Amino acid sequence: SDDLSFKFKNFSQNGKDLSFQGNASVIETGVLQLNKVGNNLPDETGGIARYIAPIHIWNCNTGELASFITSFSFFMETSANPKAATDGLTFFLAPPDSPLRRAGGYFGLFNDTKCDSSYQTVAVEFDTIGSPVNFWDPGFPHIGIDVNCVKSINAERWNKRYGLNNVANVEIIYEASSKTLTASLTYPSDQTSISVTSIVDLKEILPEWVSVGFSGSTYIGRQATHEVLNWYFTSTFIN
Amino acid sequence: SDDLSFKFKNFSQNGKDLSFQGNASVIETGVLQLNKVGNNLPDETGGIARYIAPIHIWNCNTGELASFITSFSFFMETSANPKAATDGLTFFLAPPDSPLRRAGGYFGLFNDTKCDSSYQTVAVEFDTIGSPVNFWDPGFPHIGIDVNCVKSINAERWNKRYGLNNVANVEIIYEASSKTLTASLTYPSDQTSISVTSIVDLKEILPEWVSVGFSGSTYIGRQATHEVLNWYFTSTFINT
Numbered sequence: 083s084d085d086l087s088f089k090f091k092n093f094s095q096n097g098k099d100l101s102f103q104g105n106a107s108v109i110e111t112g113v114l115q116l117n118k119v120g121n122n123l124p125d126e127t128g129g130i131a132r133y134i135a136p137i138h139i140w141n142c143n144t145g146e147l148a149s150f151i152t153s154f155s156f157f158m159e160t161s162a163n164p165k166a167a168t169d170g171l172t173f174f175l176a177p178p179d180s181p182l183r184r185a186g187g188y189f190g191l192f193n194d195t196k197c198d199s200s201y202q203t204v205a206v207e208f209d210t211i212g213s214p215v216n217f218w219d220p221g222f223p224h225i226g227i228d229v230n231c232v233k234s235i236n237a238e239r240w241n242k243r244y245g246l247n248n249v250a251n252v253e254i255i256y257e258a259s260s261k262t263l264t265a266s267l268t269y270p271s272d273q274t275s276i277s278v279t280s281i282v283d284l285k286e287i288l289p290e291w292v293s294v295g296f297s298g299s300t301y302i303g304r305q306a307t308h309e310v311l312n313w314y315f316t317s318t319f320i321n
Numbered sequence: 322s323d324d325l326s327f328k329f330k331n332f333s334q335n336g337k338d339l340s341f342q343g344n345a346s347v348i349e350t351g352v353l354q355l356n357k358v359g360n361n362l363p364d365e366t367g368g369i370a371r372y373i374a375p376i377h378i379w380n381c382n383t384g385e386l387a388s389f390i391t392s393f394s395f396f397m398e399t400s401a402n403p404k405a406a407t408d409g410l411t412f413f414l415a416p417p418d419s420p421l422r423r424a425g426g427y428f429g430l431f432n433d434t435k436c437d438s439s440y441q442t443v444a445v446e447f448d449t450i451g452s453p454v455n456f457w458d459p460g461f462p463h464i465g466i467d468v469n470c471v472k473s474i475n476a477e478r479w480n481k482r483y484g485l486n487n488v489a490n491v492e493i494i495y496e497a498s499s500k501t502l503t504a505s506l507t508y509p510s511d512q513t514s515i516s517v518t519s520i521v522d523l524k525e526i527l528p529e530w531v532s533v534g535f536s537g538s539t540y541i542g543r544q545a546t547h548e549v550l551n552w553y554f555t556s557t558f559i560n561t
Protein backbone atom coordinates (compact mmCIF):
# COMPACT_ATOMS: atom_id res chain seq x y z
CA SER A 83 0.00 0.00 0.00
CA ASP A 84 1.08 3.67 -0.06
CA ASP A 85 0.01 4.56 3.51
CA LEU A 86 -0.16 2.21 6.49
CA SER A 87 -0.65 2.70 10.22
CA PHE A 88 -1.59 0.45 13.09
CA LYS A 89 -1.75 0.77 16.83
CA PHE A 90 -1.56 -1.90 19.54
CA LYS A 91 -2.72 -0.57 22.96
CA ASN A 92 -1.79 -4.01 24.27
CA PHE A 93 -1.40 -7.50 22.77
CA SER A 94 -3.70 -10.52 22.79
CA GLN A 95 -2.73 -14.15 23.32
CA ASN A 96 -4.92 -15.42 20.51
CA GLY A 97 -4.11 -12.67 18.03
CA LYS A 98 -3.59 -13.33 14.33
CA ASP A 99 -1.60 -10.35 12.98
CA LEU A 100 1.95 -11.12 14.29
CA SER A 101 4.70 -13.57 13.21
CA PHE A 102 6.93 -15.16 15.83
CA GLN A 103 10.32 -16.84 15.47
CA GLY A 104 12.43 -18.28 18.25
CA ASN A 105 10.90 -17.95 21.68
CA ALA A 106 8.96 -14.71 21.24
CA SER A 107 5.30 -14.73 22.36
CA VAL A 108 2.37 -12.85 23.94
CA ILE A 109 1.84 -13.71 27.62
CA GLU A 110 -1.40 -13.82 29.69
CA THR A 111 -0.93 -10.21 30.86
CA GLY A 112 -1.15 -8.95 27.27
CA VAL A 113 2.56 -8.15 26.96
CA LEU A 114 4.82 -8.93 24.00
CA GLN A 115 7.71 -10.97 25.46
CA LEU A 116 10.63 -11.02 23.01
CA ASN A 117 12.57 -13.85 24.68
CA LYS A 118 12.29 -16.49 27.40
CA VAL A 119 14.46 -17.15 30.49
CA GLY A 120 14.92 -20.59 32.08
CA ASN A 121 17.49 -23.38 32.15
CA ASN A 122 15.72 -25.33 29.39
CA LEU A 123 17.30 -22.85 26.88
CA PRO A 124 20.58 -22.73 24.85
CA ASP A 125 23.51 -20.51 25.97
CA GLU A 126 22.63 -17.98 23.27
CA THR A 127 18.85 -17.58 23.20
CA GLY A 128 16.32 -15.07 21.81
CA GLY A 129 13.19 -14.30 19.80
CA ILE A 130 11.62 -12.34 16.90
CA ALA A 131 8.17 -10.80 16.32
CA ARG A 132 6.98 -8.74 13.32
CA TYR A 133 3.70 -7.37 11.97
CA ILE A 134 2.32 -9.94 9.48
CA ALA A 135 2.01 -7.56 6.49
CA PRO A 136 5.04 -6.34 4.48
CA ILE A 137 5.52 -2.55 4.33
CA HIS A 138 6.17 -0.84 0.92
CA ILE A 139 9.30 1.18 1.97
CA TRP A 140 10.56 2.51 -1.41
CA ASN A 141 9.16 2.44 -4.96
CA CYS A 142 11.51 1.74 -7.89
CA ASN A 143 9.22 2.97 -10.69
CA THR A 144 8.86 6.48 -9.26
CA GLY A 145 12.18 6.49 -7.41
CA GLU A 146 10.38 7.43 -4.19
CA LEU A 147 11.22 6.64 -0.59
CA ALA A 148 8.76 6.54 2.33
CA SER A 149 8.96 8.47 5.63
CA PHE A 150 7.90 6.58 8.80
CA ILE A 151 7.60 7.02 12.55
CA THR A 152 7.13 4.48 15.28
CA SER A 153 6.92 4.56 19.07
CA PHE A 154 6.63 1.96 21.81
CA SER A 155 7.24 1.44 25.55
CA PHE A 156 9.28 -1.41 26.98
CA PHE A 157 10.75 -2.75 30.21
CA MET A 158 13.17 -5.55 31.15
CA GLU A 159 13.56 -7.91 34.11
CA THR A 160 16.55 -9.91 35.36
CA SER A 161 17.32 -12.34 38.19
CA ALA A 162 21.08 -11.74 37.67
CA ASN A 163 23.05 -8.54 38.39
CA PRO A 164 21.77 -5.46 36.43
CA LYS A 165 25.29 -4.41 35.41
CA ALA A 166 25.98 -7.86 33.92
CA ALA A 167 22.67 -8.87 32.25
CA THR A 168 22.69 -9.34 28.44
CA ASP A 169 21.93 -8.60 25.62
CA GLY A 170 19.16 -6.10 24.80
CA LEU A 171 16.49 -5.65 22.13
CA THR A 172 16.18 -4.04 18.66
CA PHE A 173 13.65 -2.51 16.29
CA PHE A 174 14.49 -3.47 12.69
CA LEU A 175 13.64 -3.47 8.95
CA ALA A 176 14.70 -6.57 6.92
CA PRO A 177 13.37 -8.78 4.09
CA PRO A 178 10.00 -10.39 5.05
CA ASP A 179 11.45 -13.87 4.67
CA SER A 180 14.66 -13.46 6.72
CA PRO A 181 15.33 -16.36 9.14
CA LEU A 182 16.28 -16.27 12.81
CA ARG A 183 20.06 -15.81 12.91
CA ARG A 184 22.38 -16.15 15.96
CA ALA A 185 21.30 -15.01 19.43
CA GLY A 186 23.31 -13.65 22.35
CA GLY A 187 25.15 -10.49 21.35
CA TYR A 188 23.94 -10.92 17.75
CA PHE A 189 20.27 -10.14 18.49
CA GLY A 190 19.15 -13.01 16.26
CA LEU A 191 19.83 -10.77 13.23
CA PHE A 192 23.50 -11.54 12.40
CA ASN A 193 25.78 -14.60 12.02
CA ASP A 194 29.00 -12.94 13.28
CA THR A 195 30.97 -9.66 13.46
CA LYS A 196 31.78 -9.42 9.72
CA CYS A 197 29.75 -6.73 7.92
CA ASP A 198 27.86 -7.91 4.78
CA SER A 199 25.51 -6.01 2.43
CA SER A 200 23.56 -9.27 1.92
CA TYR A 201 21.87 -8.82 5.33
CA GLN A 202 19.75 -5.94 4.03
CA THR A 203 18.99 -5.08 7.67
CA VAL A 204 18.60 -1.68 9.36
CA ALA A 205 18.16 -1.92 13.11
CA VAL A 206 18.13 0.41 16.08
CA GLU A 207 19.68 -1.58 18.97
CA PHE A 208 19.27 -1.14 22.72
CA ASP A 209 22.53 -2.87 23.60
CA THR A 210 22.76 -3.71 27.32
CA ILE A 211 26.31 -5.13 27.36
CA GLY A 212 29.52 -3.77 25.82
CA SER A 213 33.26 -4.55 25.87
CA PRO A 214 35.22 -6.43 27.15
CA VAL A 215 32.29 -8.92 26.95
CA ASN A 216 31.41 -7.87 23.37
CA PHE A 217 34.72 -6.65 21.93
CA TRP A 218 33.06 -4.87 18.98
CA ASP A 219 31.14 -2.63 21.45
CA PRO A 220 32.07 0.49 23.52
CA GLY A 221 32.83 -0.08 27.24
CA PHE A 222 29.22 0.56 28.39
CA PRO A 223 25.50 -0.01 27.53
CA HIS A 224 24.37 2.07 24.55
CA ILE A 225 21.79 2.75 21.81
CA GLY A 226 23.01 2.71 18.22
CA ILE A 227 22.09 2.47 14.55
CA ASP A 228 23.17 -0.69 12.73
CA VAL A 229 23.42 -1.07 8.97
CA ASN A 230 24.12 -4.62 7.74
CA CYS A 231 26.44 -5.18 10.68
CA VAL A 232 26.61 -5.78 14.44
CA LYS A 233 29.00 -2.73 14.49
CA SER A 234 26.87 0.43 14.84
CA ILE A 235 27.74 3.22 12.40
CA ASN A 236 26.96 5.42 15.40
CA ALA A 237 26.07 4.88 19.08
CA GLU A 238 25.51 6.87 22.28
CA ARG A 239 25.86 6.19 26.02
CA TRP A 240 22.87 4.54 27.71
CA ASN A 241 22.39 4.25 31.47
CA LYS A 242 20.21 1.10 31.53
CA ARG A 243 17.54 0.59 34.24
CA TYR A 244 15.59 -2.57 35.11
CA GLY A 245 12.11 -3.34 36.45
CA LEU A 246 8.48 -2.54 35.58
CA ASN A 247 8.87 0.74 37.52
CA ASN A 248 11.48 1.78 34.97
CA VAL A 249 9.40 1.72 31.77
CA ALA A 250 11.17 3.31 28.76
CA ASN A 251 9.50 5.47 26.07
CA VAL A 252 10.99 5.03 22.61
CA GLU A 253 10.44 7.03 19.42
CA ILE A 254 12.06 6.34 16.06
CA ILE A 255 11.61 8.49 12.97
CA TYR A 256 12.92 8.47 9.42
CA GLU A 257 12.49 11.56 7.28
CA ALA A 258 13.00 10.59 3.62
CA SER A 259 13.78 14.07 2.23
CA SER A 260 16.87 14.42 4.45
CA LYS A 261 17.64 10.67 4.68
CA THR A 262 17.78 11.20 8.49
CA LEU A 263 17.17 8.32 10.95
CA THR A 264 16.59 9.55 14.55
CA ALA A 265 15.94 7.47 17.70
CA SER A 266 15.26 8.81 21.18
CA LEU A 267 14.74 7.02 24.50
CA THR A 268 13.06 8.71 27.48
CA TYR A 269 12.41 7.64 31.06
CA PRO A 270 9.24 9.48 32.11
CA SER A 271 9.92 8.95 35.89
CA ASP A 272 12.75 11.52 36.06
CA GLN A 273 12.73 12.66 32.41
CA THR A 274 16.18 11.39 31.37
CA SER A 275 16.47 11.54 27.57
CA ILE A 276 19.08 10.32 25.04
CA SER A 277 19.40 10.32 21.23
CA VAL A 278 21.32 9.09 18.15
CA THR A 279 21.11 10.16 14.51
CA SER A 280 22.67 9.13 11.20
CA ILE A 281 22.17 9.88 7.52
CA VAL A 282 21.27 6.59 5.82
CA ASP A 283 19.89 5.94 2.34
CA LEU A 284 17.42 3.09 2.81
CA LYS A 285 16.96 2.84 -0.96
CA GLU A 286 20.36 1.20 -1.48
CA ILE A 287 20.26 -1.18 1.52
CA LEU A 288 16.73 -2.59 1.70
CA PRO A 289 14.48 -4.29 -0.85
CA GLU A 290 11.25 -2.44 -1.77
CA TRP A 291 9.16 -4.59 0.58
CA VAL A 292 10.33 -5.20 4.19
CA SER A 293 8.79 -6.28 7.50
CA VAL A 294 8.85 -4.22 10.71
CA GLY A 295 9.40 -5.80 14.09
CA PHE A 296 11.36 -6.56 17.20
CA SER A 297 14.02 -9.03 18.43
CA GLY A 298 15.29 -9.85 21.95
CA SER A 299 18.21 -11.97 23.20
CA THR A 300 20.16 -13.00 26.29
CA TYR A 301 23.03 -15.27 27.41
CA ILE A 302 23.11 -18.11 29.94
CA GLY A 303 24.18 -16.92 33.39
CA ARG A 304 23.38 -13.25 32.76
CA GLN A 305 19.77 -13.89 31.61
CA ALA A 306 17.29 -11.04 31.26
CA THR A 307 13.87 -10.83 29.62
CA HIS A 308 12.81 -8.00 27.26
CA GLU A 309 9.17 -6.93 26.85
CA VAL A 310 6.98 -4.53 24.89
CA LEU A 311 3.77 -2.94 26.20
CA ASN A 312 2.37 -1.20 23.13
CA TRP A 313 3.29 -0.21 19.56
CA TYR A 314 2.33 2.51 17.08
CA PHE A 315 3.56 2.67 13.46
CA THR A 316 2.81 4.83 10.42
CA SER A 317 4.45 5.15 6.98
CA THR A 318 3.51 7.24 3.99
CA PHE A 319 4.96 8.26 0.65
CA ILE A 320 3.19 11.62 0.81
CA ASN A 321 4.91 13.50 3.66
CA SER B 322 -4.28 -4.45 16.45
CA ASP B 323 -6.78 -1.97 17.87
CA ASP B 324 -6.44 0.50 14.98
CA LEU B 325 -5.61 -0.23 11.35
CA SER B 326 -5.63 1.95 8.28
CA PHE B 327 -4.15 1.59 4.79
CA LYS B 328 -4.50 3.29 1.41
CA PHE B 329 -3.73 2.00 -2.06
CA LYS B 330 -3.64 4.88 -4.60
CA ASN B 331 -3.22 2.17 -7.26
CA PHE B 332 -1.83 -1.40 -7.23
CA SER B 333 1.62 -2.82 -8.15
CA GLN B 334 2.27 -6.11 -9.93
CA ASN B 335 5.01 -7.27 -7.53
CA GLY B 336 3.04 -6.29 -4.43
CA LYS B 337 3.42 -8.46 -1.35
CA ASP B 338 0.44 -7.36 0.75
CA LEU B 339 -2.60 -8.87 -1.07
CA SER B 340 -3.60 -12.53 -1.02
CA PHE B 341 -5.22 -14.01 -4.18
CA GLN B 342 -7.56 -16.94 -4.91
CA GLY B 343 -9.11 -18.04 -8.20
CA ASN B 344 -8.44 -15.80 -11.17
CA ALA B 345 -7.90 -12.36 -9.61
CA SER B 346 -4.62 -10.36 -9.99
CA VAL B 347 -3.00 -6.98 -10.50
CA ILE B 348 -2.51 -6.19 -14.21
CA GLU B 349 0.12 -3.99 -16.01
CA THR B 350 -2.03 -0.85 -15.82
CA GLY B 351 -1.92 -0.91 -11.99
CA VAL B 352 -5.56 -2.05 -11.62
CA LEU B 353 -6.86 -4.91 -9.44
CA GLN B 354 -8.74 -7.32 -11.76
CA LEU B 355 -11.12 -9.52 -9.79
CA ASN B 356 -11.85 -12.04 -12.55
CA LYS B 357 -10.67 -12.72 -16.06
CA VAL B 358 -12.68 -13.29 -19.23
CA GLY B 359 -11.97 -15.51 -22.23
CA ASN B 360 -13.18 -18.87 -23.57
CA ASN B 361 -10.52 -21.06 -21.91
CA LEU B 362 -12.17 -20.77 -18.43
CA PRO B 363 -14.76 -22.88 -16.53
CA ASP B 364 -18.47 -21.96 -17.13
CA GLU B 365 -18.72 -20.33 -13.68
CA THR B 366 -15.50 -18.36 -13.18
CA GLY B 367 -14.22 -15.79 -10.65
CA GLY B 368 -11.54 -14.52 -8.23
CA ILE B 369 -10.90 -13.14 -4.70
CA ALA B 370 -8.38 -10.65 -3.25
CA ARG B 371 -7.90 -9.80 0.45
CA TYR B 372 -5.51 -7.62 2.44
CA ILE B 373 -2.90 -10.01 3.91
CA ALA B 374 -3.34 -9.11 7.61
CA PRO B 375 -6.52 -10.14 9.56
CA ILE B 376 -8.59 -7.37 11.21
CA HIS B 377 -9.63 -7.49 14.88
CA ILE B 378 -13.36 -6.83 14.47
CA TRP B 379 -14.64 -7.49 17.97
CA ASN B 380 -13.09 -8.25 21.36
CA CYS B 381 -14.38 -11.10 23.56
CA ASN B 382 -12.50 -9.83 26.64
CA THR B 383 -14.05 -6.35 26.69
CA GLY B 384 -17.23 -7.00 24.73
CA GLU B 385 -16.27 -4.18 22.37
CA LEU B 386 -17.11 -3.99 18.70
CA ALA B 387 -15.06 -1.97 16.15
CA SER B 388 -16.38 0.68 13.72
CA PHE B 389 -15.01 0.91 10.16
CA ILE B 390 -15.20 2.80 6.91
CA THR B 391 -13.95 1.78 3.47
CA SER B 392 -14.09 3.46 0.05
CA PHE B 393 -13.06 2.41 -3.47
CA SER B 394 -13.74 3.14 -7.15
CA PHE B 395 -14.54 0.40 -9.67
CA PHE B 396 -15.62 -0.12 -13.31
CA MET B 397 -16.77 -3.06 -15.44
CA GLU B 398 -16.08 -3.94 -19.09
CA THR B 399 -18.03 -6.23 -21.38
CA SER B 400 -18.26 -7.32 -25.03
CA ALA B 401 -21.74 -8.82 -24.54
CA ASN B 402 -25.02 -6.88 -24.37
CA PRO B 403 -24.72 -4.88 -21.04
CA LYS B 404 -28.25 -5.81 -19.84
CA ALA B 405 -27.44 -9.55 -19.99
CA ALA B 406 -23.85 -9.44 -18.57
CA THR B 407 -23.16 -11.10 -15.19
CA ASP B 408 -22.42 -11.50 -12.27
CA GLY B 409 -21.06 -8.58 -10.20
CA LEU B 410 -18.58 -7.83 -7.43
CA THR B 411 -18.54 -7.92 -3.64
CA PHE B 412 -16.90 -6.28 -0.59
CA PHE B 413 -16.87 -8.88 2.24
CA LEU B 414 -15.80 -9.89 5.76
CA ALA B 415 -15.16 -13.62 6.42
CA PRO B 416 -12.91 -16.06 8.34
CA PRO B 417 -9.30 -15.26 7.17
CA ASP B 418 -8.68 -18.79 6.01
CA SER B 419 -11.96 -19.43 4.16
CA PRO B 420 -11.59 -21.19 0.77
CA LEU B 421 -12.81 -20.05 -2.69
CA ARG B 422 -16.28 -21.59 -3.26
CA ARG B 423 -18.69 -21.53 -6.20
CA ALA B 424 -18.40 -18.66 -8.69
CA GLY B 425 -20.97 -17.44 -11.23
CA GLY B 426 -24.02 -16.09 -9.37
CA TYR B 427 -22.65 -17.33 -6.04
CA PHE B 428 -19.68 -14.85 -6.16
CA GLY B 429 -17.13 -17.38 -4.95
CA LEU B 430 -18.51 -16.99 -1.40
CA PHE B 431 -21.21 -19.69 -1.25
CA ASN B 432 -21.86 -23.35 -2.38
CA ASP B 433 -25.48 -22.92 -3.46
CA THR B 434 -28.70 -21.25 -2.18
CA LYS B 435 -28.88 -22.76 1.31
CA CYS B 436 -28.36 -20.25 4.16
CA ASP B 437 -25.95 -21.36 6.87
CA SER B 438 -24.50 -19.74 10.00
CA SER B 439 -21.21 -21.56 9.57
CA TYR B 440 -20.32 -19.39 6.55
CA GLN B 441 -19.72 -16.48 9.03
CA THR B 442 -19.90 -14.05 6.13
CA VAL B 443 -21.33 -10.55 5.73
CA ALA B 444 -21.11 -9.08 2.22
CA VAL B 445 -22.24 -5.98 0.37
CA GLU B 446 -23.11 -7.13 -3.17
CA PHE B 447 -23.23 -5.16 -6.48
CA ASP B 448 -25.32 -7.81 -8.23
CA THR B 449 -25.59 -7.36 -12.00
CA ILE B 450 -28.25 -10.05 -12.72
CA GLY B 451 -31.52 -11.04 -10.93
CA SER B 452 -34.53 -13.33 -11.52
CA PRO B 453 -35.45 -15.31 -13.59
CA VAL B 454 -31.75 -16.04 -14.25
CA ASN B 455 -31.10 -16.10 -10.49
CA PHE B 456 -34.39 -17.22 -8.93
CA TRP B 457 -33.44 -16.04 -5.42
CA ASP B 458 -32.97 -12.34 -6.44
CA PRO B 459 -35.41 -9.44 -7.09
CA GLY B 460 -36.24 -9.08 -10.83
CA PHE B 461 -33.49 -6.53 -11.69
CA PRO B 462 -29.80 -5.57 -10.99
CA HIS B 463 -29.38 -4.43 -7.36
CA ILE B 464 -27.04 -3.66 -4.46
CA GLY B 465 -27.72 -5.77 -1.36
CA ILE B 466 -26.64 -6.89 2.07
CA ASP B 467 -25.94 -10.62 2.55
CA VAL B 468 -25.68 -12.33 5.93
CA ASN B 469 -24.58 -15.99 5.72
CA CYS B 470 -26.56 -16.55 2.49
CA VAL B 471 -26.68 -15.65 -1.23
CA LYS B 472 -30.24 -14.34 -0.58
CA SER B 473 -30.18 -10.73 0.79
CA ILE B 474 -32.05 -9.47 3.88
CA ASN B 475 -32.37 -6.05 2.16
CA ALA B 476 -31.68 -4.85 -1.41
CA GLU B 477 -32.20 -1.73 -3.56
CA ARG B 478 -32.69 -1.38 -7.32
CA TRP B 479 -29.55 -0.45 -9.30
CA ASN B 480 -29.37 0.71 -12.93
CA LYS B 481 -25.89 -0.65 -13.77
CA ARG B 482 -23.52 1.17 -16.16
CA TYR B 483 -20.49 -0.32 -17.97
CA GLY B 484 -17.25 1.20 -19.32
CA LEU B 485 -14.27 3.25 -18.11
CA ASN B 486 -16.27 6.44 -18.65
CA ASN B 487 -18.76 5.17 -16.04
CA VAL B 488 -16.58 4.81 -12.94
CA ALA B 489 -18.52 4.44 -9.66
CA ASN B 490 -17.33 5.64 -6.23
CA VAL B 491 -18.41 3.45 -3.27
CA GLU B 492 -18.50 4.14 0.45
CA ILE B 493 -19.32 1.55 3.15
CA ILE B 494 -19.62 2.33 6.86
CA TYR B 495 -20.22 0.25 9.98
CA GLU B 496 -21.06 2.30 13.07
CA ALA B 497 -20.74 0.02 16.14
CA SER B 498 -22.90 2.08 18.57
CA SER B 499 -26.09 1.71 16.53
CA LYS B 500 -24.98 -1.48 14.66
CA THR B 501 -25.81 0.20 11.30
CA LEU B 502 -24.22 -1.00 8.03
CA THR B 503 -24.71 1.47 5.11
CA ALA B 504 -23.35 1.20 1.57
CA SER B 505 -23.72 3.88 -1.11
CA LEU B 506 -22.73 4.06 -4.75
CA THR B 507 -22.34 7.28 -6.76
CA TYR B 508 -21.71 7.89 -10.49
CA PRO B 509 -19.79 11.23 -10.48
CA SER B 510 -20.76 11.97 -14.11
CA ASP B 511 -24.34 12.88 -13.23
CA GLN B 512 -24.40 12.48 -9.45
CA THR B 513 -26.79 9.45 -9.55
CA SER B 514 -26.52 7.90 -6.08
CA ILE B 515 -28.11 4.87 -4.36
CA SER B 516 -27.77 3.37 -0.90
CA VAL B 517 -28.81 0.31 1.06
CA THR B 518 -28.76 -0.06 4.84
CA SER B 519 -29.23 -2.67 7.53
CA ILE B 520 -28.86 -3.21 11.28
CA VAL B 521 -26.88 -6.33 12.13
CA ASP B 522 -24.93 -7.36 15.23
CA LEU B 523 -21.51 -8.42 13.98
CA LYS B 524 -20.54 -10.08 17.32
CA GLU B 525 -23.25 -12.63 16.69
CA ILE B 526 -22.27 -13.48 13.12
CA LEU B 527 -18.49 -13.13 12.67
CA PRO B 528 -15.43 -14.53 14.52
CA GLU B 529 -13.20 -12.00 16.43
CA TRP B 530 -10.65 -11.82 13.58
CA VAL B 531 -11.74 -11.54 9.92
CA SER B 532 -10.13 -10.77 6.55
CA VAL B 533 -11.49 -7.91 4.35
CA GLY B 534 -11.43 -8.05 0.54
CA PHE B 535 -13.33 -8.35 -2.73
CA SER B 536 -14.66 -11.05 -5.05
CA GLY B 537 -15.74 -10.81 -8.70
CA SER B 538 -17.31 -13.39 -11.00
CA THR B 539 -19.04 -14.05 -14.32
CA TYR B 540 -20.59 -16.82 -16.49
CA ILE B 541 -20.00 -18.10 -20.13
CA GLY B 542 -21.90 -16.25 -22.81
CA ARG B 543 -22.35 -13.12 -20.69
CA GLN B 544 -18.82 -12.43 -19.54
CA ALA B 545 -17.66 -9.19 -17.99
CA THR B 546 -14.55 -8.20 -16.04
CA HIS B 547 -14.84 -6.23 -12.72
CA GLU B 548 -11.99 -3.87 -11.78
CA VAL B 549 -10.97 -1.85 -8.72
CA LEU B 550 -8.91 1.33 -9.08
CA ASN B 551 -8.00 2.24 -5.49
CA TRP B 552 -8.93 1.36 -1.96
CA TYR B 553 -8.94 3.04 1.44
CA PHE B 554 -9.81 1.26 4.73
CA THR B 555 -9.81 2.17 8.40
CA SER B 556 -11.11 0.41 11.55
CA THR B 557 -11.01 1.43 15.18
CA PHE B 558 -12.52 0.50 18.56
CA ILE B 559 -12.10 4.06 19.77
CA ASN B 560 -14.72 5.78 17.59
CA THR B 561 -15.24 9.56 18.11
Ligand SMILES: *[C@@H]1O[C@H](CO)[C@@H](O[C@@H]2O[C@H](CO)[C@@H](O)[C@H](O)[C@H]2NC(C)=O)[C@H](O[C@@H]2O[C@@H](C)[C@@H](O)[C@@H](O)[C@@H]2O)[C@H]1NC(C)=O
Nearest residue numbers: 181182183184191192193194196197198199200201202230
Ligand atom coordinates in the same frame (compact mmCIF):
# COMPACT_ATOMS: atom_id res chain seq x y z
C1 LIG C 1 24.64 -16.54 7.57
O1 LIG C 1 24.82 -17.92 7.90
C2 LIG C 1 24.17 -18.81 6.96
C3 LIG C 1 24.41 -20.22 7.47
O2 LIG C 1 23.49 -20.56 8.50
C4 LIG C 1 24.70 -18.59 5.53
O3 LIG C 1 23.94 -19.41 4.61
C5 LIG C 1 24.61 -20.49 4.06
O4 LIG C 1 25.32 -20.03 2.91
C6 LIG C 1 26.09 -21.08 2.30
C7 LIG C 1 27.01 -20.43 1.28
O5 LIG C 1 26.30 -19.56 0.41
C8 LIG C 1 25.14 -22.14 1.72
O6 LIG C 1 25.90 -23.20 1.13
C9 LIG C 1 24.26 -22.71 2.86
O7 LIG C 1 23.27 -23.59 2.33
C10 LIG C 1 23.59 -21.60 3.68
N1 LIG C 1 23.10 -22.20 4.91
C11 LIG C 1 21.83 -22.07 5.31
C12 LIG C 1 21.50 -22.77 6.62
O8 LIG C 1 20.98 -21.44 4.67
C13 LIG C 1 24.57 -17.13 5.12
O9 LIG C 1 25.25 -16.90 3.85
C14 LIG C 1 24.66 -15.96 2.99
O10 LIG C 1 23.54 -16.50 2.27
C15 LIG C 1 23.88 -17.49 1.29
C16 LIG C 1 22.57 -18.01 0.70
C17 LIG C 1 24.85 -16.90 0.24
O11 LIG C 1 24.21 -15.86 -0.49
C18 LIG C 1 26.10 -16.35 0.94
O12 LIG C 1 26.96 -15.71 -0.01
C19 LIG C 1 25.70 -15.35 2.02
O13 LIG C 1 26.86 -14.90 2.73
C20 LIG C 1 25.20 -16.25 6.18
N2 LIG C 1 24.98 -14.85 5.86
C21 LIG C 1 25.99 -13.98 5.87
C22 LIG C 1 25.61 -12.55 5.51
O14 LIG C 1 27.16 -14.29 6.14
Ligand SMILES: *[C@@H]1O[C@H](CO)[C@@H](O[C@@H]2O[C@H](CO)[C@@H](O)[C@H](O)[C@H]2NC(C)=O)[C@H](O[C@@H]2O[C@@H](C)[C@@H](O)[C@@H](O)[C@@H]2O)[C@H]1NC(C)=O
Nearest residue numbers: 420421422423430431432433435436437438439440441469
Ligand atom coordinates in the same frame (compact mmCIF):
# COMPACT_ATOMS: atom_id res chain seq x y z
C1 LIG D 1 -19.96 -26.40 1.10
O1 LIG D 1 -19.36 -27.38 0.23
C2 LIG D 1 -18.25 -28.06 0.87
C3 LIG D 1 -17.59 -28.95 -0.16
O2 LIG D 1 -18.35 -30.13 -0.39
C4 LIG D 1 -18.75 -28.80 2.11
O3 LIG D 1 -17.65 -29.47 2.75
C5 LIG D 1 -17.66 -30.86 2.73
O4 LIG D 1 -18.82 -31.29 3.47
C6 LIG D 1 -18.84 -32.71 3.69
C7 LIG D 1 -20.22 -33.07 4.23
O5 LIG D 1 -20.52 -32.31 5.40
C8 LIG D 1 -17.67 -33.06 4.61
O6 LIG D 1 -17.74 -34.41 5.07
C9 LIG D 1 -16.40 -32.83 3.82
O7 LIG D 1 -15.27 -33.11 4.63
C10 LIG D 1 -16.34 -31.37 3.33
N1 LIG D 1 -15.30 -31.26 2.32
C11 LIG D 1 -14.51 -30.18 2.28
C12 LIG D 1 -13.45 -30.15 1.19
O8 LIG D 1 -14.61 -29.26 3.10
C13 LIG D 1 -19.39 -27.79 3.05
O9 LIG D 1 -19.87 -28.43 4.25
C14 LIG D 1 -19.77 -27.65 5.41
O10 LIG D 1 -18.57 -27.90 6.13
C15 LIG D 1 -18.45 -29.24 6.64
C16 LIG D 1 -17.10 -29.33 7.32
C17 LIG D 1 -19.62 -29.54 7.58
O11 LIG D 1 -19.51 -28.74 8.75
C18 LIG D 1 -20.97 -29.29 6.88
O12 LIG D 1 -22.04 -29.45 7.81
C19 LIG D 1 -21.01 -27.88 6.27
O13 LIG D 1 -22.18 -27.72 5.46
C20 LIG D 1 -20.53 -27.13 2.31
N2 LIG D 1 -21.32 -26.28 3.18
C21 LIG D 1 -20.82 -25.15 3.68
C22 LIG D 1 -21.76 -24.36 4.59
O14 LIG D 1 -19.66 -24.77 3.47
Ligand SMILES: [Ca+2]
Nearest residue numbers: 187209211216
Ligand atom coordinates in the same frame (compact mmCIF):
# COMPACT_ATOMS: atom_id res chain seq x y z
CA1 LIG E 1 26.43 -6.05 22.86
Ligand SMILES: [Ca+2]
Nearest residue numbers: 426448450455
Ligand atom coordinates in the same frame (compact mmCIF):
# COMPACT_ATOMS: atom_id res chain seq x y z
CA1 LIG F 1 -27.49 -12.44 -9.03
Ligand SMILES: [Mn+2]
Nearest residue numbers: 209219226234
Ligand atom coordinates in the same frame (compact mmCIF):
# COMPACT_ATOMS: atom_id res chain seq x y z
MN1 LIG G 1 26.38 -2.61 20.16
Ligand SMILES: [Mn+2]
Nearest residue numbers: 446448458465
Ligand atom coordinates in the same frame (compact mmCIF):
# COMPACT_ATOMS: atom_id res chain seq x y z
MN1 LIG H 1 -28.52 -10.77 -5.35
